[PDB]
Amino acid sequence: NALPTWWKQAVFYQVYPRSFKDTNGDGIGDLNGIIENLDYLKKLGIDAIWINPHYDSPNTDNGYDIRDYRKIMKEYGTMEDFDRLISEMKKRNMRLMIDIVINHTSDQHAWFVQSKSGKNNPYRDYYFWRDGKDGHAPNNYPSFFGGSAWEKDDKSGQYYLHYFAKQQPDLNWDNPKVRQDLYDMLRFWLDKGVSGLRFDTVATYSKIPNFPDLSQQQLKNFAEEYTKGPKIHDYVNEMNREVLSHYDIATAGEIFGVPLDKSIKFFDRRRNELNIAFTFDLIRLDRDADERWRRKDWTLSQFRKIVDKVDQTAGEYGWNAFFLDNHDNPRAVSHFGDDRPQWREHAAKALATLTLTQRATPFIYQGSELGMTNYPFKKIDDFDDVEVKGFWQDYVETGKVKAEEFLQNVRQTSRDNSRTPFQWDASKNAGFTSGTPWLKINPNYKEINSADQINNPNSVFNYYRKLINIRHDIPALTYGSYIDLDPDNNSVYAYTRTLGAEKYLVVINFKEEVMHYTLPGDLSINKVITENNSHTIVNKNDRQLRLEPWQSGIYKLNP
Ligand SMILES: [Ca+2]
């Protein structure tokens, strides 16, 4: 029964404003820098842009600690700039999604400033304030960003709750006044015409009644305890009923800490909650659930089995986003491909083909379209992210893990690998800034930059452009049902996308050797749609493919 919508068949691009384009030489990207480059994104073929938080913030967590929801970040520009970004996008038929961060505010936000003044302030129970127990915190909750999730306040002697930085106190959603104020805030932005909202850590809004301690076992996977709040779907559905269902918008849910088997309740269209699932299963398939900075080896069979299970779980009534990287994860060509110079461009084109042939709304993160890589961080001070500093404090400063072993993992897992500034050209600081970038630019910018690619028809950029054109032209690549040809194959990832008689096959060789691959059953090729790194001709009725290393392709199959 499912209906097409613009957001199901959109190709989104994600801009992290702080690292996209600086137009005033302070080293920090800003809104004018986005506006300046809308034609570049239109040329790529992007339907909609999701921007990370753009609100007044002290930047403990680069926009995710909001000091005033109705004001533009000072480093990003003014309200007039933000309105111009909407206006200039609208002229180009591009839709804007903004990031909604309402699990918590900055500890500088006026509500918290008031809350913390005494048990008595009308804003006290806007946040969570509990007595200590035995001269320590109210319970054994840890924070995602290091140490205890409870911060002592010497004035009152109680502690306040912060799942994330102590500068990110959690809002009390159990207070209907808090929920009402947040809805008013959402209407202020929605009335400006924004087309989409992405809800940061949407699954933590409901806290566990009476805050009991976590078990020893729970402490090793605590995020999954924080998403078990008994009213979470009541609150998300109330927000849908009172606000979301009043605008023509697309809503995405970042369901951090939600196991896949509890995800469909946020996205089933019958439930009137949210529209698009942002899950962590694939992008962190190789991350430890306890030591969340640690990675382990992974295989293509592990990867594809997660793709399939994520696809199955959305089923008839939910809907997924699909992304291999974003501002919270290492770059896709490094993590999932081979970023050495022999292979980088082929592997980036193969992961683009994978991304843009999923039954999901694809999100392209800034710079993935050039094949940008992870950055060669050497020492702990080369990073800037609050989260990596919290993991260092919890695991290296306690002597639990050697500094060098920790660094070998966070070089591969740090959020900062995707935050080095966008590589526009081969000029100084890759054309990102006339001043000093806030985070050092990868020296590979001389090889990997947009200017070198945009007019080269063989570039990663133009392969993405072609794939997006192909996706927009073939309905089965958006809405077709997905079948993995062999979930246990660790060499060649092959799967079909089917709408009625229209059946297409995607084949990607993840090996760096030639692989012969014979199709199953009676499948045979009707025609080639696109290939990268092919050295062979594929004809009507062919049943076998010779795949060069990192070869990728889309084919239409015979009925
Ligand atoms: Ca700037």
Numbering used by the authors: 42 to 600
Question: How did the manuscript describe this experimental structure?
Answer:
SIases, classified as glycoside hydrolase family 13 (GH13) enzymes, catalyze the isomerization of sucrose to produce isomaltulose and trehalulose as primary products and D-glucose and D-fructose as by-products.
There is one molecule in the asymmetric unit of the crystal lattice. In the NX-5 structure, the magnesium ion was about 23 Å away from the active site pocket, suggesting its function may be structural rather than catalytic. The active site of NX-5 is located in a pocket that is approximately 25 Å deep from the negatively charged surface. Phe321 and Phe297 in NX-5 are closer to the catalytic325RLDRD329 motif and residue Glu295.
